[PDB]
A paper describes a structure:
The Na+,K+-[name] generates electrochemical gradients of Na+ and K+ across the plasma membrane via a functional cycle that includes various phosphoenzyme intermediates. The enzyme is a binary complex of a large α-subunit of the P-type [name] family responsible for ion transport and enzymatic reaction and a β-subunit acting as a chaperone and functional modulator. Furthermore, regulatory FXYD proteins may associate with the complex in a tissue-dependent manner. The ion exchange is driven by ATP hydrolysis via enzyme autophosphorylation and dephosphorylation, and a minimal scheme of the Na+,K+-[name] cycle, also termed the Post-Albers scheme, includes two major conformations, E1 and E2, in their phosphorylated and nonphosphorylated states.
Here, we describe a 4.0 Å resolution crystal structure and functional properties of the pig kidney Na+,K+-[name] stabilized by the inhibitor beryllium fluoride (denoted E2–[name]). [name] coordinated to the conserved Asp369 phosphorylation site in the conserved DKTG segment of the P domain was identified in unbiased initial Fo–Fc difference map. The TGES loop of the actuator (A) domain is in close proximity to [name] and protects the phosphorylation site from spontaneous hydrolysis. The structure resembles the E2P form obtained by phosphorylation from inorganic phosphate (Pi) and stabilized by cardiotonic steroids, including a low-affinity Mg2+ site near ion binding site II. The extracellular ion pathway is formed by the transmembrane (TM) αM1–M6 helices, which define an outward-open arrangement similar to SERCA1a in the Mg2+-stabilized E2–[name] form. The arrangement of αM2–M5 helices in Na+,K+-[name], however, is slightly more compact, and the residues lining the pathway have larger hydrophobic side chains (e.g., Tyr308, Phe316, Phe783, and Phe786 in Na+,K+-[name] corresponding to Phe279, Ile298, Ile775, and Thr778 in SERCA). The extracellular ion pathway is thus narrow but solvated, consistent with a low voltage sensitivity of K+ binding through such a pathway and a voltage-insensitive release of the third and last Na+ ion from the Na+-bound state. For the cation-binding sites in the TM domain, we observed a residual density near site II in the initial unbiased Fo–Fc difference map, similar to a Mg2+ site in the E2P–OBN complex. Indeed, the E2–[name] crystals were grown in the presence of 175 mM MgCl2, and Mg2+ binding is likely to stabilize an open conformation as seen also for the E2–[name] complex of SERCA1a, although the site is shifted. The E2–[name] crystal structure reveals that the cation-binding cavity is open to the extracellular side and occupied by a Mg2+ ion.
Author numbering:
A (entry chain E): 17 to 48
B (entry chain D): 13 to 303
C (entry chain C): 726 to 1016
D (entry chain C): 94 to 141
E (entry chain C): 288 to 384
The structure:
Amino acid sequence: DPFYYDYETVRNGGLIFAALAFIVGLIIILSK
Amino acid sequence: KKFIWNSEKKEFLGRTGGSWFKILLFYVIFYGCLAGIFIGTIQVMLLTISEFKPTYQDRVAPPGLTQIPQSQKTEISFRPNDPQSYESYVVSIVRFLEKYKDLAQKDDMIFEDCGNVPSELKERGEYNNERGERKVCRFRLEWLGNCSGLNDETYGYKDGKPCVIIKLNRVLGFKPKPPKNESLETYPVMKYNPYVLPVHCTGKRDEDKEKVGTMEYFGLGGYPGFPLQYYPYYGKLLQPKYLQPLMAVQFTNLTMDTEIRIECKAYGENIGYSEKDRFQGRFDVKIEVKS
Amino acid sequence: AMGIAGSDVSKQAADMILLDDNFASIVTGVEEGRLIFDNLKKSIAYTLTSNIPEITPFLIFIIANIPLPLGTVTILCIDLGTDMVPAISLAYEQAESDIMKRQPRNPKTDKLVNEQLISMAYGQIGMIQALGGFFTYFVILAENGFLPIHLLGLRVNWDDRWINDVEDSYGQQWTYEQRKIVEFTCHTPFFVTIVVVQWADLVICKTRRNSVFQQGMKNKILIFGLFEETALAAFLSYCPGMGVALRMYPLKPTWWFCAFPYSLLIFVYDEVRKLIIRRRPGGWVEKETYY
Amino acid sequence: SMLLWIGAILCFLAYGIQAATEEEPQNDNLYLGVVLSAVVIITGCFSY
Amino acid sequence: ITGVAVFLGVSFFILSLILEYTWLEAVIFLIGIIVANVPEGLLATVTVCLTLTAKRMARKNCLVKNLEAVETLGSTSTICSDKTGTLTQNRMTVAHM
Ligand SMILES: CC(C)CCC[C@@H](C)[C@H]1CC[C@H]2[C@@H]3CC=C4C[C@@H](O)CC[C@]4(C)[C@H]3CC[C@]12C
Ligand SMILES: CC(C)CCC[C@@H](C)[C@H]1CC[C@H]2[C@@H]3CC=C4C[C@@H](O)CC[C@]4(C)[C@H]3CC[C@]12C
Ligand SMILES: *[C@@]1(O)O[C@H](CO)[C@@H](O)[C@H](O)[C@H]1NC(C)=O
Ligand SMILES: CC(=O)N[C@@H]1[C@@H](O)[C@H](O)[C@@H](CO)O[C@H]1O
Ligand SMILES: [Mg+2]
Ligand SMILES: [Mg+2]
């Protein structure tokens, strides 16, 4: 049915991006 | 403290007259530019949407169950004796049913007699304007039983024992799927499993359940379900003046001068419900006929 | 005074103490002073610009009786959620030029929040920022068949908690919670878009005079903040049940890039003005816009 | 801090006026005052 | 800040009743418009920023009892110092031979 979205997928997708994003600025700010 | 009106430098509101003009020009040009961008961006967005089908329909996946008399709080309270008390309620019924008379469906060209019994859902092509302006299935007020607005009670409607119908939210492309024969909760007030989507109403509250003993359902062909044949809806632009199927209920023995609650539940495979939306395929009402 | 070589009474009276007794601190002292003074101008501006898009929906919400484009909850996530981290980062910015070379400000002639700042943020950057937000707002609605032209005056029937037969221009019927779930879902990108534009406003407000590349993006705090801000926003929409606790629902991917151009346009506009300030020390660019 | 305070009290006062007039009004303006005031308290604690 | 806010709130308060809105709600807007206009997060931003700058002063043994005093040194136009102790080392010391 065209009235269903695999929200959980992009939901998890977003989670992943944000989690990854945090570690990146973290790496940057803790530059050594 | 507020003497910026004038100065030796001829500042108006603390500002020079010529420069005012210069600022005015900048703002005007700039603001026009932004709007010109904004509108142009919007024009794009217009062209990213089809004119026949919406791009996203996931939100309306659970259908809804509206009522004809839209009470400020789903509550009906009035005097049977007093016309004025129920006059306002009556008016709402009048407007909705106005576009349903046999006379209203004057043009045979745009009206198809679907039939006098439920029949196969009528798929009407792919949703494109390659075909023409598609056809609508009719619906006579006579189909409503003993709750006909313009017939037995043309202006009276119900002075006591009021009628109340439910309606399915008009939805593009919904293919209803009637429930299978074997459902444990299913109470078979009718045996029409093949071509009807049943709606049954119960008090929900035990106190209310006792309060109303019986209710009378009226359906096309004496069947208490939406006709599968009428659907699917093809869109307002594609199908102007499309008529939603109507199902009516008239309550029988009732408790007067008391408040009771009735829960109307649609059933079928393709129907969901939510404990946060009291109207998402479910239905509640508070009703009190005080004399 | 000098901590180890000074009278105790004088030290208490003094507003500043030197432990090492290195008189050189004064030099660093004024250096920081004139430096922090500027960076505050920068910092204050970033938050201020945000208010124009913050407030704007509320205004039109009354003017044209449309569904509310932005929730108060999200605003808090901007003023006090995302925006803060970049705002702190601004202070770390190094001096554009050697400040020690310039004269003391005059407390009458030069002020912290000048008239220019307002016109720059409230008048221009914020207004562009707001336009990006509305674009996204109109886009989402249309993409679910709620056409911009058709959204006028719709507020009244919209916010009613009982009218569940609202008609979209496509022609479908919607229940209260659904169309609310949409209004909430619509609110979330407005917030998101706000971060997208606040990207540009952050960069441009990193420098007053020199170009962006000229200053260089060596400020680690600023960089970490952008990622932190972005991550927070993203998480804010995709954590389990945010639409339950804070009434903020997930986002369909194409939404994220809704206003990337709007912000880019912002970045382009400020940079070209910075160049215009550079090329010519003429007053019109300076007096009107050099906050 | 004082200026923010005036807004908060103003938010708090606003909710009362709102509650009396409408029916079941949204707790938005109220929520605003609490956070606004809290900000000052937190700010004050840090400053002290 | 407030000066523009009142103007906006008042102007809206006018255009509110210009449209079919009652005094009862028109005030609610004027309050709300002025309210949401008020900056909120800025207070803690500025304060945190100020303390941070002082830290580096304290890193180099430059301390200030009053936090809001760091900016004053940069914003000065005239100075006056005491020759003894402040400028001198206040020690009789071998000068020239
Ligand atoms: C470096 C920056 C400025 C470039 C622009 C940021 C882009 C790459 C980031 C910022 C936020 C991100 C989005 C956050 C959430 C999701 C949900 C995920 O399931 C699909 C991708 C999507 C939609 C991401 C796409 C990439 C994205 C848009
Ligand atoms: C320099 C600037 C001003 C050029 C302007 C280009 C604009 C008008 C173009 C470039 C990229 C385009 C966007 C690309 C992505 C999407 C997602 C889509 O689902 C809605 C349209 C939208 C949002 C487009 C709108 C039109 C757009 C914004
Ligand atoms: C109907 O409403 O009216 C009839 C009188 O004309 C009556 O005999 C019949 O029982 C009624 N039926 C219902 C279902 O109300
Ligand atoms: C069309 C119809 O009535 N079909 C029913 C079927 O649903 C039911 O399961 C069966 C009982 O065994 O009896 C049949 O008559
Ligand atoms: Mg704000
Ligand atoms: Mg001395």
